[PDB]
Amino acid sequence: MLTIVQEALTFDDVLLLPAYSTVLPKDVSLKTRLTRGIYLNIPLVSAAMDTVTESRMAIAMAQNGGIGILHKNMDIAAQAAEVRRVKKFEAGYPNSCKDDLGRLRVGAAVGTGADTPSRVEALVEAGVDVIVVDTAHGHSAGVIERVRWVKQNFPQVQVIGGNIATGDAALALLDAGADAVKVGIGPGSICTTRIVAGIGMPQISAIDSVASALKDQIPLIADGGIRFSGDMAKAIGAGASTIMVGSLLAGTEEAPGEVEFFQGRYYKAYRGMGSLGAMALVPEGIEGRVPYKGPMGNIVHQMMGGLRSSMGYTGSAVIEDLRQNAKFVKITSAG
Amino acid sequence: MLTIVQEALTFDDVLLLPAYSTVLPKDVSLKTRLTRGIYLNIPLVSAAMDTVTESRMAIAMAQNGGIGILHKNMDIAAQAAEVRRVKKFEAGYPNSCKDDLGRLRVGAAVGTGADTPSRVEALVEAGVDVIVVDTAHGHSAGVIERVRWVKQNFPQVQVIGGNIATGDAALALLDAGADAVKVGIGPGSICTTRIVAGIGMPQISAIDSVASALKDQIPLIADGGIRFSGDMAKAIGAGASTIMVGSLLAGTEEAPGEVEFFQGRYYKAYRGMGSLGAMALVPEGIEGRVPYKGPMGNIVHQMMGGLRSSMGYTGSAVIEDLRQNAKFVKITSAG
Amino acid sequence: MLTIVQEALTFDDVLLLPAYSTVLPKDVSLKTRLTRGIYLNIPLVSAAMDTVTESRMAIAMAQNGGIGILHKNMDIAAQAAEVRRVKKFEAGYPNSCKDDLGRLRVGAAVGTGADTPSRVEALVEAGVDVIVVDTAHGHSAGVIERVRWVKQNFPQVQVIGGNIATGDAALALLDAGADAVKVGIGPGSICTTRIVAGIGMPQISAIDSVASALKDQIPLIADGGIRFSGDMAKAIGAGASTIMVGSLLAGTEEAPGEVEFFQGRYYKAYRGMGSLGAMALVPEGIEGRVPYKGPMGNIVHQMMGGLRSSMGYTGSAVIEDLRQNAKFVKITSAG
Amino acid sequence: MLTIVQEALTFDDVLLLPAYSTVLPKDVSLKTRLTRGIYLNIPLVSAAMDTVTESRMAIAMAQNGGIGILHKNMDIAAQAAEVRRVKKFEAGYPNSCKDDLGRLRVGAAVGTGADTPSRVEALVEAGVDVIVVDTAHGHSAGVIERVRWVKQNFPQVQVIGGNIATGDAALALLDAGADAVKVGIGPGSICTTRIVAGIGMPQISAIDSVASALKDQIPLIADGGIRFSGDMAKAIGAGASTIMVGSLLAGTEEAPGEVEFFQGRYYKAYRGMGSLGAMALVPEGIEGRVPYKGPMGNIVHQMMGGLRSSMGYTGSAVIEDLRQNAKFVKITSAG
Amino acid sequence: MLTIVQEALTFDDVLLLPAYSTVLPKDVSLKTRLTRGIYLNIPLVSAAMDTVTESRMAIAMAQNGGIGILHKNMDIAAQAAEVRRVKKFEAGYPNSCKDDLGRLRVGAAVGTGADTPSRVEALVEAGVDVIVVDTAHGHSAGVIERVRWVKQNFPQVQVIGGNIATGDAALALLDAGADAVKVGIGPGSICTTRIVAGIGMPQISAIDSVASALKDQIPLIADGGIRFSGDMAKAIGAGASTIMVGSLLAGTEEAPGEVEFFQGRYYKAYRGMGSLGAMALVPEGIEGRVPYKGPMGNIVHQMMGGLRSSMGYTGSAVIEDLRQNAKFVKITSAG
Numbered sequence A, B, C, D, E: 001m002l003t004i005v006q007e008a009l010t011f012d013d014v015l016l017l018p019a020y021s022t023v024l025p026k027d028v029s030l031k032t033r034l035t036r037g038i039y040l041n042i043p044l045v046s047a048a049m050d051t052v053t054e055s056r057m058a059i060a061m062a063q064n065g066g067i068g069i070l071h072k073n074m075d076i077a078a079q080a081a082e083v084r085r086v087k088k089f090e091a092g093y094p095n096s097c098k099d100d101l102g103r104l105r106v107g108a109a110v111g112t113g114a115d116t117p118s119r120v121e122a123l124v125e126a127g128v129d130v131i132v133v134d135t136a137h138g139h140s141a142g143v144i145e146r147v148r149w150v151k152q153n154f155p156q157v158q159v160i161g162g163n164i165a166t167g168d169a170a171l172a173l174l175d176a177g178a179d180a181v182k183v184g185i186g187p188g189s190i191c192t193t194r195i196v197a198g199i200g201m202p203q204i205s206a207i208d209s210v211a212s213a214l215k216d217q218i219p220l221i222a223d224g225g226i227r228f229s230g231d232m233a234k235a236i237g238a239g240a241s242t243i244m245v246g247s248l249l250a251g252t253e254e255a256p257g258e259v260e261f262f263q264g265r266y267y268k269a270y271r272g273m274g275s276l277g278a279m280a281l282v283p284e285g286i287e288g289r290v291p292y293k294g295p296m297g298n299i300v301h302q303m304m305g306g307l308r309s310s311m312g313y314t315g316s317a318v319i320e321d322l323r324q325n326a327k328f329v330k331i332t333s334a335g
């Protein structure tokens, strides 16, 4: 007999309801926690992608109150040099996300392969704030044990495990010692996992499954499928503490890559980390072009401003009020 | 755990069912109440928008049996002059909606800002029939107290509060002393609140939630998302006493703005009050062009004719029969 | 509170299930009943529309085993002349649908207006087999009393009442003396009733509601929304005894109207009876062009062959097996 | 051997060149002659079409300084009543085009059929200023003979002959006694003559051929294919004294027909006089809808405004300067 | 150095000019000559294609005043049976094209291959009026020689040679003893000769080149690229005596093939004789579907109707007037 666990929901399936409010959007607090030890000034995290985050994006992310996760599609020395570049950065930004030493915060992605022990050690030595054990399947023994290894061998660094879509996976990573979990199997804009493997979990239900199991022991990063500022609000309302974006920050001035002149117009490359180009396993991501967006600051302010509006509508003065008091309605295909 | 209050319905999710009928559409009464003290001859209200209602539209609305709500995107003196222009209007219209003095009825929108006490006083002095405390979030303390203030300081004028989408919001505005509530968070044709804030309530469920809580103590204006005369029928069947329209009356002769010649065709501007242009908070509305529709009288007659048809099908001799006896079916994406 | 009677289904919402079968499509019987007194050799009826059925179509319909319903958009004498043209027709067709006198069967539509008593009398005198009291709202006192009048004053003729969409309406027409009921409020291809009045009932649920109330006391004609032969099979499986088609027979050689040369291609006019053109109440139908289809015989054979296939799949040797033993599955938007 | 008379040009093939100018657009004179005896204040004439000109359009045309040509698709009495309606019209318009008696000027179309002698007599008696012998082929002996008959029998009325496209045709009508010639075989927006008969003459070359042969003995009306104000200027520069428009004035308030609601948008019918609908010979015109344009006055002012600019660019103080001193360039498909 | 013989023109490059006229379209004569010995009542010939002409089409063609050319994509006995079927046909058509014996006229196509001598003999014995030596290249030695053989061995039959596009080719076929010459290299709707071989001649220039060389010694059939009745007028004006059509008669009831139901609509197959399907050399034709057009008689009457109109415009009382006196204008891409 067929095991249908639930009818799973995505961002477009739901709407947040307005509630009694004494807070104006301009006055809400966007401060949240990335991990149990790291706090951010905005709930935004830039994706660990070779077309989204390198030192330039990580600096801009940290200056705006968030954090950048440096991609792992570079050799250990190149990646350690990128961590140092952010940690040693000095400006000529009051909401800057900084460590105890007043340096800009940064994260770096690691895999589970042979190079991981050397990669983790080089990144910790360079002063990385958080190690992200970055995979397509966080509910594997390789990820769970690598998370345990990072925590036991480098307790001075925060560790994130992903990607997950269920509460069982969250509990496994919590028991291993993760300081946060990254949620998202199938919601990515460049994701073909659903087509290739027939695997996935609609993001609102993934956030819910994970947040319900964790019971706020560790925060969760809602990773993938964010298209509008409304999706960020819905993700936080569903239980997320932070939001990871790829697409929205791709195309910006601070993102890696040069601007290309295609059909008169200006673009930047955007590709999945499991795409043919990025891998050089069957590909699980697509390669494409995104329009040139200019400085990332504008996109970030547009997105945060929409989140402030939502918190104004829901009567959420702080991120934690949205996370605890959000009420939703399920909408149909017509809505 | 995720709080899904209900599966919320919009106009396209439902159809009214035909019932035993002894009334022909030509003989149905379209008389209804705008507020607990103001009655209309047709359940139509023109939107408080700088591209929909100024004195010209308000006069045409009142002559046709409805009412116009003058927009607040003008200074106190300009708005008071517009109220007087409607109140002093004399023709060279048997269904005219008039006050005790035989003058055409008019409404005016007010905000919650510093200018509101002076604005209310100037509008009441000019002879305004109804003050509309017109905001994006009526369930805010600011709107509730402004509603309370208008009622206590100017009992001689009727007051509406909004916009709302829940029964709790309705009860809070009823307790403050509102004479009617305006329903609509997200259904507007030019609305981007759902995209920007991820906030909203499908209109049939919004009307239902509000009407069920009010228990006919005060009427509700179903504001936004009306595209056809069938939506009006469905809105009244769901519990609305009146319907507010922006889109349908935009592009008409009586609406503000000059006709523009674009690619042969004739157009008029139509924009949200929370759009970039209208504000000059992140924008929550779009700016656009609507085709030129000629005299508003033609659109009004087409809309009321369709509503008369629906009342004929449901055996509704008066507006109150449709509100109390309407039976619906939920339809799927295929329907 | 909102009264949602049910989630109503249309043709596209369901699929018939294959069952154990000892019958090949070539051997199935398509014989059914139009009214409790009139039997057809095929469950097909041509619509009472000025672009679908006049004497030419009614002759071709009767020769193929079905029946034509002559439209009422012509004067009493013109309509009576048309009935005679079919009653006096002699060929130079073994499945012909004929009366006791061996003459081809025909029906004629009547309204409820002042001319109805004279129209009914002229049609009965010309040898009409069935009077169809054709309207948009069968559940109106006007139709129930006109149906009762036709039965009491002309018991020698069969009478159909409609259009209806509910069981309550069917019982009212049954008590009035109708020999059959016509089902369809909103499914028509040229119907704008759902848009104009917000009134309607998805056809599978309309057939079901009516058939369940009638308990086979009188047959029902499933009228409107038939696009494919599978829709017919679905309609019969849901409880229909016959199917009425407009658009499928529009554009055929036999249908009224001349062929028009438009952008190389050949077309015929097809319009709703409640469209602007047909009326000359707000219009509830659209006017259009349908491609030239050639002799109607081909369309009829393609449609009947599909129903034979379906009956082969369901193990239905006779029409009554499909009506009694059909099992369905509800499908989603993806299906 | 193939006789190619010339490479013939349409409006889009040419552009007028700017010249030394001392007269501003606001100060130019748009006064011109319709016939050798009739002068207009603007070079605009409304088409003799049942979807363009009846008394309402003819009055509005004359008030704006132009003239209307009443269509012949009505009985002699109906047409004579339309002439009188214009001649007897009194306002509650300084550029009004009036006769010696101060009455608004009007024209009426006639054919070559049996009713023509009675038609001409009734129109002359009704006070028509100009008889237009209105056909698809003015170079036919029938039209030349009817033009001669009107001039010899009714010298007190002005007479126009057409439609023509060559200098030979112009000279034949000039010898027949025509007071003006109407130019246009194939340029019409609803014209299918080029497809049906393979007959036609690109409008700039038609105007040129005719103007060059006439040597200003009688003026020419450039009839058909005017889409913009630029077309008008090019036609006058090529030799036209006036311009006849159908589609530009179709869909205006004053044009015959009611406004129809179709796909939310408002329209009016526009059809060729040789279309199936207008005739009820193979049809040589199409039937369609044009968007509702509102008052004709706006269209007329936009057109004259553009012709004023062209005259300002060419240094044409009067219409005759444009006619005599215009210099063109031939442009390619790329231009 | 590059040899550009001329700038060659197609139908769309030219328009016929109106001229002085004393003839009405209804009174014009459409009588012409197919060959030096065979006269037709209408200048229309149906194409020798397996989707256009078999005995059914050839009978309908001859009854309408034209002639059918039976395709050669059948064995000698099958083709001879088709000739006899037409010759022996007796009706229950005053413009019928008949021989001296009062039998319907017919033509048959032959190739240059081994079976040609036996094929010619069987067709002549069956009473064929004209042998058509049907090829892609009439200027080939094989065709000129087969034409010579048919004339010397069977002087009792008329012989047509083709296809050609130049005057040199016409003179070679005239010296061979051809009674007519078929013109058309590249104009066909299903032709890919221009793409495959880069060979071709725009049809107006092909007709002109051929007619100018022949000096009326033998007539020419303008074969291919006729889309409208205007093309026919242009082809005759350019020097053609008759017109051969494939696409226009494909999809008619009389054309070979069954009607196919595809995406609701009704179609018939239409394919080039040099297409993959027809051959079973690289293919030089495409295979497709054409809409069902109904009886060919309607298409023929609409086509001849438009030709009568053109003759009325050009003052052509007979086909020879249009051939000898036609004057054209070259039009641009804008026209």
Ligand SMILES: C[C@H](Nc1ccc2ncc(CO)cc2c1)C(=O)Nc1ccc(Cl)c(N2CCOCC2)c1
Binding pocket: A112, A135, A136, A137, A138, A140, A142, A143, A163, A184, A185, A186, A187, A188, A191, A193, A272, A273, A274, A275, A281, A282, A283, A284, A285
């Ligand atoms: C090609 C694809 N590449 C990518 C790349 C980045 C991705 N990032 C996110 C998501 C979430 O849908 C999928 C992604 C797939 C990828 O990695 N597929 C993939 C498929 C199945 C498993 Cl079990 C694993 N795992 C191996 C054991 O260790 C855990 C991983 C990996």
Ligand SMILES: C[C@H](Nc1ccc2ncc(CO)cc2c1)C(=O)Nc1ccc(Cl)c(N2CCOCC2)c1
Binding pocket: A021, A023, A024, A025, A309, A310, A312, A313, B112, B135, B136, B137, B138, B140, B142, B143, B163, B184, B185, B186, B187, B188, B191, B193, B272, B273, B274, B275, B281, B282, B283, B284, B285
């Ligand atoms: C820019 C947008 N502007 C508009 C403009 C017109 C609108 N009209 C209707 C709706 C309903 O969707 C939304 C609209 C948004 C707007 O006003 N957003 C907005 C967002 C959140 C809150 Cl709490 C408030 N409130 C502040 C406290 O006082 C109550 C309001 C207002």
Ligand SMILES: C[C@H](Nc1ccc2ncc(CO)cc2c1)C(=O)Nc1ccc(Cl)c(N2CCOCC2)c1
Binding pocket: B021, B023, B024, B025, B309, B310, B312, B313, C112, C135, C136, C137, C138, C140, C142, C143, C163, C184, C185, C186, C187, C188, C191, C193, C272, C273, C274, C275, C281, C282, C283, C284, C285
């Ligand atoms: C314009 C439209 N015209 C049409 C025309 C043909 C139709 N045929 C079928 C259907 C089913 O949707 C609707 C149609 C509407 C039409 O007739 N609307 C209409 C609307 C409401 C009512 Cl109570 C009635 N009734 C009057 C009392 O007597 C019963 C009728 C009729």
Ligand SMILES: C[C@H](Nc1ccc2ncc(CO)cc2c1)C(=O)Nc1ccc(Cl)c(N2CCOCC2)c1
Binding pocket: D112, D135, D136, D137, D138, D140, D142, D143, D163, D184, D185, D186, D187, D188, D191, D193, D272, D273, D274, D275, D281, D282, D283, D284, E021, E023, E024, E025, E309, E310, E312, E313
């Ligand atoms: C059906 C078409 N109808 C129309 C109607 C209006 C038109 N108005 C303008 C133009 C210009 O292309 C063509 C039009 C064709 C039309 O009249 N064709 C037409 C074709 C050929 C000729 Cl000899 C004549 N003539 C008959 C003798 O008397 C002179 C006319 C007329």
Ligand SMILES: C[C@H](Nc1ccc2ncc(CO)cc2c1)C(=O)Nc1ccc(Cl)c(N2CCOCC2)c1
Binding pocket: E112, E135, E136, E137, E138, E140, E142, E143, E163, E184, E185, E186, E187, E188, E191, E193, E272, E273, E274, E275, E281, E282, E283, E284, E285
């Ligand atoms: C495949 C194509 N088939 C067709 C079929 C029918 C056609 N019918 C007409 C036209 C005119 O463009 C082209 C066609 C090409 C075809 O026959 N091409 C073709 C190409 C070149 C030459 Cl010399 C010959 N010739 C061989 C010597 O004998 C003379 C012919 C034939």
Ligand SMILES: O=c1[nH]cnc2c1ncn2[C@@H]1O[C@H](COP(=O)(O)O)[C@@H](O)[C@H]1O
Binding pocket: A047, A048, A049, A163, A184, A187, A188, A189, A190, A191, A192, A193, A223, A224, A225, A226, A244, A245, A246, A247, A248, A271, A272, A273, A274, A275, A284, A285, A286
């Ligand atoms: O190739 C890939 N396949 C599937 N998901 C991917 C791939 N590369 C990155 N992702 C995920 O997609 C996210 C970006 O999603 P987006 O913001 O919707 O564009 C990243 O943070 C990853 O979790």
Ligand SMILES: O=c1[nH]cnc2c1ncn2[C@@H]1O[C@H](COP(=O)(O)O)[C@@H](O)[C@H]1O
Binding pocket: B047, B048, B049, B163, B184, B187, B188, B189, B190, B191, B192, B193, B223, B224, B225, B226, B244, B245, B246, B247, B248, B271, B272, B273, B274, B275, B284, B285, B286
């Ligand atoms: O900028 C805006 N954002 C969202 N809703 C708006 C905005 N401006 C006006 N509205 C609402 O939209 C209604 C008009 O909706 P419509 O009739 O669907 O066009 C107004 O009466 C307001 O309630």
Ligand SMILES: O=c1[nH]cnc2c1ncn2[C@@H]1O[C@H](COP(=O)(O)O)[C@@H](O)[C@H]1O
Binding pocket: C047, C048, C049, C163, C184, C187, C188, C189, C190, C191, C192, C193, C223, C224, C225, C226, C244, C245, C246, C247, C248, C271, C272, C273, C274, C275, C284, C285, C286
């Ligand atoms: O104007 C109209 N409005 C709505 N329904 C119509 C109208 N005219 C006819 N109908 C219905 O539509 C049916 C034809 O539906 P169809 O087969 O889907 O085209 C007719 O038999 C009538 O019941």
Ligand SMILES: O=c1[nH]cnc2c1ncn2[C@@H]1O[C@H](COP(=O)(O)O)[C@@H](O)[C@H]1O
Binding pocket: D047, D048, D049, D163, D184, D187, D188, D189, D190, D191, D192, D193, D223, D224, D225, D226, D244, D245, D246, D247, D248, D271, D272, D273, D274, D275, D284, D285, D286
């Ligand atoms: O049926 C028709 N066929 C061709 N030309 C027509 C027909 N009816 C009117 N016309 C011409 O088209 C002109 C209008 O052209 P338009 O301004 O381009 O729409 C009229 O003044 C007539 O000269």
Ligand SMILES: O=c1[nH]cnc2c1ncn2[C@@H]1O[C@H](COP(=O)(O)O)[C@@H](O)[C@H]1O
Binding pocket: E047, E048, E049, E163, E184, E187, E188, E189, E190, E191, E192, E193, E223, E224, E225, E226, E244, E245, E246, E247, E248, E271, E272, E273, E274, E275, E284, E285, E286
């Ligand atoms: O395969 C082919 N290639 C090129 N021309 C063809 C082919 N088959 C037939 N034709 C020609 O195309 C003509 C039909 O042209 P149509 O009337 O434009 O469709 C025939 O009479 C042949 O001369």
